[PDB]
């Protein structure tokens, strides 16, 4: 058999399914959400693919593996080692960038280290080396009275164990050795791990720059230069480093010893920018809080940290308190008196101000304030003053910004001076990294370069240069041309992240692999779709075999074989509805998929659309943030708006970092940092903002649908207030798995335990003591309508909904969860196991569980995610419902149906990153399909 075969897969609601798949095909898994698609694809097939292979690695890791919950199948075979390509992790670590993620940056450092020449930062003369003598002369010329410790870094972070070395240093007695930070009396050194890299510097002298101490000055400096390989580092008291091999000709100091490849890593201290330490950024309070038009009243407030009841009454007073005392009152707009504004911001006059207050009873007749409560110090103060979430709440008046020293570049300047001489500029590695598009970098690295990669360096760095462009190549291929090497890894969308992984994997040149991909058409424009299907195929064609969980027409159309997964949701699914070619699937009358796919079903374009109100329009003005080009954009209120456009066009920066962040500030009063812009129009036409993020519901198995929606409180009471419970004296609290009495003590009531996996990813294994119940057995003695807590927590929501039809206080929450489509989800199903869409959808069911006051605004970022056709159809009703109450709903989408249904679309582009951040078209679908310049328009037009 050239076949992948599975018998009796039972992993979740999977009903002992058997499959006979064509290896060396692009297989696509398909069906309604919560069909079991993923349990089969990822939890069983892949999971086993990986496992069986890894078991080989070492007979040891074979044990470390033993402690996994091997997926529940009976027999599988024709199984290639598997590799997952989902969109699960968007790690927030600051230092890590595309460059780093793709290892491309790594190669860059080798390329720079070993070809292309360094320069001094100021004088700039090609950089020479330097004789111990004129290193003694530099230091002799120093400031008299300066005191510094001649220090010699014999070991610059290399690894070893240095017992022999410590002796040779007690051999001429030092007693002052710093290793790995901590200082050790060189009589008594520490034992070192030969395995860990190390940092051993001996103090050679504590000195001072007297004229005629020249003898010890000269006599120490030569010794350190000798003992630590020509490196002295004098570390002052009133540090500066000197290298034998790297020197400004004209005697400027250079703050970096070797030009070694690490010296480029803004992760190593050696290259990293000293100020921000290669973080690139500094959190730094903007003068931005404000609104220039409003000023100082309670109804008219100016200075944002100072707008309340007691806080507001208190500071307004003190402003005008100095405001006839500097002549600016409390009734001029912020953009009004230049002298006046610099006051509340800086320290200004610093003249005691008259503060009048009513005493504890009424007494009054006291007090001043030693200070104009200097505003930018209210900040430093209160960030310090109250330890809390509040601290981040105050942080909301600061803005990450590039570091002035390192220019944002996260780099020690001397490094920035190293230079690859190709065409217009021998741009720094960072100049190359910060290049606008992958193509921008590829062009210089790929062409502008080899053709002046000199005959010495072609021999020593030529291969490296090749390895780089190959890699840039594949990036273009996955259509990532538009981002830059230097972009932060965390910022990239799940799609973008995934699209990268695909570039890495496709390049890997691996054959015989089973790649299991999770919905890669996500966050990808309809345009780039047929492009990606190619890269997918060429991945198969290389000699691999794919399984793609998907609901996209084109991808499915293009599949070699299709498994359609049990019809219905949860219990109702988990069976192989279809498994065969595309045509054959169309024939299948039981495929909900086939229905839509054949045409028996569709989502129909509303014959009468919602009409837009010009007078009632929410408007972002002058959006400057990232690639947005100071645009003005108006979203019509009380209607369905899709923001569309290709990946990288600013869809997110607009709607999320600016449009949403403002509304959260102006309607729900979070103190959250909106992306740089001018302002937002009207806005008082709205009660509140609902941002249905796709972020996880919770990071712990503590968070549950029962918890999150808060139905569990209402159930814990239904339980405590029961015949069996009261006879035992059980309060509502015991039924809370969060709370010391009644929850199992081994899991602390989570039900499962996160067992660290080392090379493989960490995974939850059900607790042995509990079996994953959450509760100790005595607590489970208690029933309600013949079901314990664990049982009722285990119910599908759809199931629990019928079960609680009686208590309509609880039934409300459950109906909306069923309405939102999550019927199939288990009431107390650990939050970490929810798909970003499910999580999104749960949050959505929380606001549905509220009074729909006809002027609230909903922001749905890719709500289409992880949904089947039919699922979309259901969801759209939920949305029109919402909008028919006259609520405003704004949606970022690539999905055609959703777009073709919207009443208004805003199309950003034209391209991604640098090209883009403009409005390519806006109007009704009909209008936009009309704009020939619009990509969204192109596709939209085939449907309109
Ligand atoms: Zn210089
Ligand atoms: Zn910096
Ligand atoms: Zn337990």
**Which ligand is in closest contact with the Cα of 411?**
2
Helix (H, G, I), strand (E, B) or coil at 32: coil
CB atoms within 10 A of CB 463: 12
CB atoms within 10 A of CB 924: 17
Residue 646 labelled as part of a binding site: yes
Q: Is residue 319 a contact partner of residue 331, using CB atoms and an 8 Å limit?
A: no
Task: Write out the DSSP string of 377-430.
Answer: HHHHHHHHH--SSHHHHHHTTEEEEE-TTTTTTTB-TTGGG----BTTB---HH
Element (H, E) at 673: none
Which residue range is the domain that position 865 belongs to? 603-695+835-944
Choose the final residue of a domain: 803, 834, 865. 834
Helix (H, G, I), strand (E, B) or coil at 184: strand
Looking up residue 799, the CATH number of its domain turns out to be: 1.20.1580.10
**Which ligand is in closest contact with the Cα of 120?**
1
Burial group, residue 570, by CB count within 10 angstroms (0-12, 13-18, 19+): buried
Q: How far apart are CA 500 and CA 736, in angstroms?
A: 43
Q: How far is the CA of 120 from the centre of ligand 1 (A)?
A: 5
Residue 57 labelled as part of a binding site: no
**Which ligand is in closest contact with the Cα of 701?**
3
Q: Which residue has the tokens 């966050």?
A: 523
Residue 647 labelled as part of a binding site: yes
Residue 181 labelled as part of a binding site: no
Q: Is residue 161 a contact partner of residue 193, using CB atoms and an 8 Å limit?
A: yes
Provide the β-strand partners of residue 765: 753
Q: How far apart are CA 633 and CA 623, in angstroms?
A: 8
Provide the β-strand partners of residue 203: 151
**Which ligand is in closest contact with the Cα of 752?**
3
Residue 703 labelled as part of a binding site: no
Q: How far is the CA of 119 from the centre of ligand 1 (A)?
A: 8
* C-alpha triplet 84, 869, 919: angle, nearest 5°: 85
Q: At what angle do helices 494-507 and 527-541 cross, to 10 degrees?
A: 30
Q: Which residue has the tokens 């399914």?
A: 17
Element (H, E) at 799: helix 797-803
Q: Is residue 586 a contact partner of residue 593, using CB atoms and an 8 Å limit?
A: no
Q: Verify that 153 and 81 share a domain, yes or no.
A: no
Q: How far is the CA of 136 from the centre of ligand 1 (A)?
A: 18
Q: How far apart are CA 510 and CA 502, in angstroms?
A: 12
Residue 35 labelled as part of a binding site: yes
Q: Verify that 701 and 823 share a domain, yes or no.
A: yes
Q: How far apart are CA 740 and CA 737, in angstroms?
A: 8
Q: How far is the CA of 705 from the centre of ligand 1 (A)?
A: 64
Backbone phi, psi, residue 717, to 5° = -70, -45
Chain breaks in the chain (C to N over 2.5 A) after: 238
Q: Verify that 821 and 714 share a domain, yes or no.
A: yes
Q: From residue 331, how far is each of 250, 328, 346, 351, 860 by CA, in Å?
A: 59, 8, 20, 21, 40
Q: Which tokens belong to 353?
A: 């101000």
What was the resolution (in A) of this experimentally determined structure?
A: 3.4
Q: How far is the CA of 374 from the centre of ligand 2 (A)?
A: 28
Provide the β-strand partners of residue 179: 200
Q: Verify that 498 and 573 share a domain, yes or no.
A: yes
Residue 648 labelled as part of a binding site: yes
Q: Verify that 809 and 708 share a domain, yes or no.
A: yes
Q: From residue 195, how far is each of 159, 180, 267, 674, 902 by CA, in Å?
A: 6, 14, 20, 47, 61
User: What is the edge-to-edge ordering of all strands in the sheet holding 197-206?
Assistant: 183-184, 177-179, 197-206, 148-159, 232-236, 240-242
Q: Is residue 453 a contact partner of residue 882, using CB atoms and an 8 Å limit?
A: no
Q: Verify that 333 and 253 share a domain, yes or no.
A: no
**Which ligand is in closest contact with the Cα of 252?**
1
Residue 453 labelled as part of a binding site: no
Q: How far is the CA of 402 from the centre of ligand 2 (A)?
A: 7
Residue 651 labelled as part of a binding site: yes
Q: How far is the CA of 926 from the centre of ligand 3 (A)?
A: 58
Residue 649 labelled as part of a binding site: yes
DSSP classification of residue 283? E
Q: Verify that 291 and 431 share a domain, yes or no.
A: no
Q: Verify that 874 and 941 share a domain, yes or no.
A: yes
Q: Which of 25, 109, 932, 154 is nearest to 537 (CA)?
A: 25
Q: How far apart are CA 287 and CA 862, in angstroms?
A: 33
Q: How far apart are CA 387 and CA 897, in angstroms?
A: 48
Q: Which residue has the tokens 């015989």?
A: 512
Q: How far is the CA of 734 from the centre of ligand 3 (A)?
A: 15
Q: How far is the CA of 828 from the centre of ligand 3 (A)?
A: 15
Q: How far apart are CA 778 and CA 773, in angstroms?
A: 12
Q: Verify that 55 and 98 share a domain, yes or no.
A: no
Looking up residue 29, the CATH number of its domain turns out to be: 3.40.50.300
Q: Verify that 830 and 741 share a domain, yes or no.
A: yes
Choose the final residue of a domain: 802, 834, 866. 834
User: What's the total number of domains in the chain?
Assistant: 6
Looking up residue 188, the CATH number of its domain turns out to be: 3.30.190.20
- 842-881 burial code (b ≥16 CB/10 A, e <16): bbbbbebbeeeeebbbbbbbbbbbbbbbbbbbbbbebbee
Choose the final residue of a domain: 180, 207, 239. 239
Q: Verify that 632 and 681 share a domain, yes or no.
A: yes
3-state helix vs strand vs coil in the chain, percent to 5: 35, 15, 50
Residue 38 labelled as part of a binding site: yes
Q: Which tokens belong to 836?
A: 């970003």
Q: Verify that 749 and 826 share a domain, yes or no.
A: yes
Q: Is residue 908 a contact partner of residue 660, using CB atoms and an 8 Å limit?
A: no
Q: Which residue has the tokens 């609230």?
A: 856
Q: How far is the CA of 624 from the centre of ligand 3 (A)?
A: 52
Q: Is residue 375 a contact partner of residue 344, using CB atoms and an 8 Å limit?
A: yes
Q: How far is the CA of 201 from the centre of ligand 1 (A)?
A: 27
DSSP classification of residue 861? E
Looking up residue 347, the CATH number of its domain turns out to be: 1.10.8.280
**Which ligand is in closest contact with the Cα of 254?**
1
Q: Which tokens belong to 226?
A: 């000798």
Q: How far is the CA of 126 from the centre of ligand 1 (A)?
A: 9
Helix (H, G, I), strand (E, B) or coil at 818: helix
Q: How far is the CA of 110 from the centre of ligand 1 (A)?
A: 24
Q: How far apart are CA 713 and CA 715, in angstroms?
A: 5
Q: How far is the CA of 404 from the centre of ligand 2 (A)?
A: 6
Q: Which tokens belong to 110?
A: 């080798």
Structure determined via:
X-ray
Q: Which tokens belong to 835?
A: 């798909």
């Amino acid at each position: 058999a050239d076949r992948l075969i599975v018998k009796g897969a039972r992993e979740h609601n999977l009903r002992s399914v058997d499959l006979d798949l064509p290896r060396d095909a692009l297989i696509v898994f398909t069906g309604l959400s919560g069909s079991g698609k993923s349990s089969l694809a990822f939890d069983t097939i892949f999971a086993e693919g990986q496992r069986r292979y890894v078991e080989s690695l070492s007979a040891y890791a074979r044990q470390f593996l033993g402690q996994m919950d091997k997926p529940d199948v009976d027999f599988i075979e024709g199984l290639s080692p598997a590799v997952s390509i989902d969109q699960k992790s968007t790690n927030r670590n600051p230092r890590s960038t595309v460059g780093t993620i793709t290892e491309v940056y790594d190669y860059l450092r080798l390329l720079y280290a070993r070809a292309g020449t360094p320069h001094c930062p100021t004088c700039g003369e090609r950089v020479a080396r330097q004789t111990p003598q004129q290193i003694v002369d530099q230091v002799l010329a120093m400031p008299e009275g300066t005191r510094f410790l001649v220090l010699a870094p014999v070991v610059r972070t290399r690894k070893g164990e240095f017992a022999d070395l410590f002796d040779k240093l007690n051999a001429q007695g030092y007693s002052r050795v710093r290793v790995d930070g901590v200082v050790h009396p060189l009589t008594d050194p520490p034992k070192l791990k030969k395995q860990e890299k190390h940092d051993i510097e001996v103090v050679v002298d504590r000195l001072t720059v007297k004229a005629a101490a020249k003898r010890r000055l000269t006599d120490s400096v030569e010794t350190a230069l000798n003992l630590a390989d020509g490196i002295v580092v004098l570390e002052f008291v009133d540090e500066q480093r000197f290298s034998e091999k790297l020197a400004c000709p004209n005697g400027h100091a250079l703050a970096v010893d070797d030009l070694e490849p690490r010296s480029f890593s803004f992760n190593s201290p050696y290259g990293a920018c000293p100020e921000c330490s290669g973080l690139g950024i500094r959190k730094e309070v903007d003068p931005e809080l404000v609104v220039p038009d409003p000023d100082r009243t309670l109804a008219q407030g100016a200075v944002a940290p100072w707008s309340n009841g007691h806080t507001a009454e208190y500071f307004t007073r003190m402003m005008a308190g100095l405001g006839e005392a500097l002549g600016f009152d409390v009734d001029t707009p912020w953009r009004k008196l230049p002298a006046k504004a610099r006051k509340a911001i800086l320290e200004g006059a610093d003249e005691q101000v008259h503060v009048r207050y009513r005493n504890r009873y009424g007494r009054t007749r006291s007090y001043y304030a030693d200070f104009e409560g200097v505003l930018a110090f209210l900040q430093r103060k209160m960030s310090q003053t109250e330890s809390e979430q509040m601290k981040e709440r105050y942080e909301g008046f600061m803005r990450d910004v590039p570091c002035p020293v390192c220019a944002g570049t996260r780099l020690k300047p001397e490094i920035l001076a190293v230079t690859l001489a190709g065409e217009s500029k021998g741009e720094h590695g960072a100049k190359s990294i910060a290049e606008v598009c992958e193509l921008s970098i590829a062009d210089c690295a790929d062409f502008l370069n080899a053709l002046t990669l000199g005959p010495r360096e072609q021999a020593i760095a030529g291969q490296v240069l090749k390895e780089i462009r190959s890699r840039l190549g594949f990036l273009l291929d996955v259509g990532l041309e538009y981002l830059s090497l230097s972009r932060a890894a965390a910022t990239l969308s799940g799609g973008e992240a995934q699209r990268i992984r695909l570039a890495t994997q496709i390049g890997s040149g691996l054959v015989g692999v089973l790649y299991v991909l999770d919905e890669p058409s996500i966050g990808l424009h309809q345009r780039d779709n047929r492009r990606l299907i190619e890269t997918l195929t060429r991945l198969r064609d290389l000699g691999n075999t794919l399984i793609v969980v998907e609901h996209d027409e084109d991808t499915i159309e293009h599949a070699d074989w299709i498994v359609d997964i049990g019809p219905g949701a949860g219990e109702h699914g988990g069976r192989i509805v279809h498994s065969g070619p595309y045509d054959e699937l169309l024939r299948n009358k039981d495929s909900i998929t086939g229905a839509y796919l054949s045409g028996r079903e569709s989502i129909e374009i509303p014959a009468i659309r919602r009409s837009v109100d010009p007078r009632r329009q929410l408007t972002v003005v002058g959006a400057r943030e990232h690639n947005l080009r100071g645009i003005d954009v108006s979203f019509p209120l009380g209607v369905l708006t899709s923001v569309t456009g290709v990946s990288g066009s600013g869809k997110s920066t607009l709607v999320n970092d600016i449009l949403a962040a403002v509304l959260a500030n102006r309607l729900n009063g979070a103190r959250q940092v909106p992306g740089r812009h001018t302002r937002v129009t009207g806005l008082d036409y709205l009660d509140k903002l609902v941002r249905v993020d796709q972020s996880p519901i919770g990071r712990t198995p503590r968070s549950n649908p029962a918890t999150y929606t808060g139905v569990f409180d209402k159930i814990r009471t239904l339980f405590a207030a029961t015949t069996e419970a009261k006879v035992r004296g059980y309060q509502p609290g015991r039924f809370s798995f969060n709370v010391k009495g009644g929850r199992c003590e081994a899991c602390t009531g989570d039900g499962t335990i996160k067992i660290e996996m080392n090379f493989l990813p960490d995974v939850y294994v059900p607790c042995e003591v509990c079996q994953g119940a959450r509760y100790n057995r005595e607590t489970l003695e208690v029933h309600y309508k013949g079901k314990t807590v664990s049982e009722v927590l285990d119910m599908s929501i759809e199931e629990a909904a019928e079960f609680f039809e009686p208590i309509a206080g609880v039934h409300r929450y459950l109906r909306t969860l069923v309405d939102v489509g999550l019927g199939y989800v288990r009431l107390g199903q650990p939050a970490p196991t929810l798909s970003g869409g499910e999580a999104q959808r749960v949050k959505l069911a929380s606001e549905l569980q509220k009074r729909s006051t006809g002027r609230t605004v909903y922001i749905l970022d890719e709500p289409t995610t992880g949904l089947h056709f039919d699922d979309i159809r259901k969801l759209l009703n939920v949305i029109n419902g919402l909008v028919d109450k006259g609520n405003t709903v704004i949606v970022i989408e690539h999905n055609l149906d959703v777009i073709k249904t919207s009443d208004w679309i805003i199309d950003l582009g034209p391209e991604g990153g640098a090209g883009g951040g403009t409005v390519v078209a806006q109007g009704t679908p009909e209008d936009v399909a009309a704009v020939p310049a619009s990509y969204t328009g192109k596709f939209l037009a085939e449907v309109v």
